[PDB]
A paper describes a structure:
The crystals of mtbMGL diffracted to a resolution of 1.8 Å. The cap-region has a Z like shape which resembles the specific architecture observed in other structurally characterized MGLs. The backbone nitrogen atoms of Met111 and Leu39 form the oxyanion hole that can stabilize the transition state intermediate during the catalytic reaction. The catalytic center is located in an approx. 18 Å deep cavity and can be reached from the outside in the observed open conformation via entry between the first and second stretch of the cap region (residues Ala138 to Arg173). The nature of the substrate-binding cavity is governed by predominantly hydrophobic side-chains located in the cap and core domains: Leu39, Ala136, Val137, Ala138, Ala139, Leu142, Val143, Val147, Ala148, Ala15, Leu154, Leu160, Val163, Phe168, Ile171, Val192, Ala194, Leu200, Leu201, Leu228 and Ile229, Pro230. The here presented crystal structure of mtbMGL corresponds to an open conformation in all three molecules of the asymmetric unit and enables a direct access path of the substrate to the catalytic sites. Based on the structural similarities of hMGL and mtbMGL it can be hypothesized that conformational changes in mtbMGL are also realized by a rolling movement of cap helix 1 similar to the one observed in hMGL. No comparable exit hole was observed in any of the molecules of the mtbMGL structure reported here. The mtbMGL crystal structure indicates a monomeric form of the lipase as analyzed with the PISA server, which is in agreement with the size exclusion chromatography of mtbMGL in solution.
Monoacylglycerol lipases (MGLs) resemble a major enzyme class involved in the hydrolysis of monoacylglycerols (MGs) to glycerol and FAs from intracellular and extracellular sources. Due to the increasing prevalence of multi-drug resistant Mtb strains, there is urgent need for the development of new drugs against tuberculosis. mtbMGL emerged as a new promising drug target due to its activity during the dormant and active stage, the reported role in host lipid degradation, membrane synthesis, and the observed severely changed phenotypical appearance of the mtbMGL ortholog in M. smegmatis. mtbMGL harbors an α/β hydrolase core consisting of 8 β-strands surrounded by 6 α-helices (Met1-Val137 and Ala194-Leu279) and a cap region (Ala138-Pro193) containing 3 α-helices. Residues Ser110, His256 and Asp226 form the active site in the core domain of mtbMGL.
Numbering used by the authors: 1 to 139, 144 to 279
The structure:
Amino acid sequence: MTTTRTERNFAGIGDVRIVYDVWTPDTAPQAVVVLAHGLGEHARRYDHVAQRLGAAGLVTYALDHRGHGRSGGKRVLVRDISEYTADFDTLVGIATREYPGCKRIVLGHSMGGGIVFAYGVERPDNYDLMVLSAPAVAASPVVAVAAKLLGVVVPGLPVQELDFTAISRDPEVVQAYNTDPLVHHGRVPAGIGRALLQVGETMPRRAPALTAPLLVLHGTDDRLIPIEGSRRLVECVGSADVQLKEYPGLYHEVFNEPERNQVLDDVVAWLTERL
């Protein structure tokens, strides 16, 4: 339809400047969506997702995490999962004040899915629906201990060598990712590894705190985050209205796959069922 983007910013944890987009369609908003991107990317890789949501009368708030895209902070530097979740909580507060009376939908992809889950456990009544795209949620006990120790002393130390070529079966998506100057083109730092384990170590203990309906999306050929971790999440959450949509043969970024228009139409159908 016609969904215009406006750029704003707020002060995050440590007074780090956090830039976010607001996508507004030319119609009375049916609900608001607060979107959390994954590791190394930024909110401008979701223009087509925000535009698709605007077609359904949804307003989308999408922020760049600290150390990502337009936001402040050292690139992909993080020391605690609470840094990500507090800034997401601040954005949800912004959207709640701007649109009172609208249902609140929290959407997260990959690391953003782990962020949205950690926020959702802390504030289970601050949102109405939750949608997760291959969430980084289930990350031996000795390696978990050592990784969280390292990430708390040298959170900027490179550790894990991630395969960007597994993000999508679309060659244009893999190419656009790799030539984007705003995108992180390095190894996973130790701080991000610790934050991921922080949501992973506590998922089965704290998943019962969730109450709002939940939809999980995951391609079966995901080589970055295994689909079995999503099968285990939906069995642990306390929410009664839960379902996981598996896309056979799709890669990590189901919103960027050639079948993205089918994936996005499944998300809009799920939301319209509950709005």
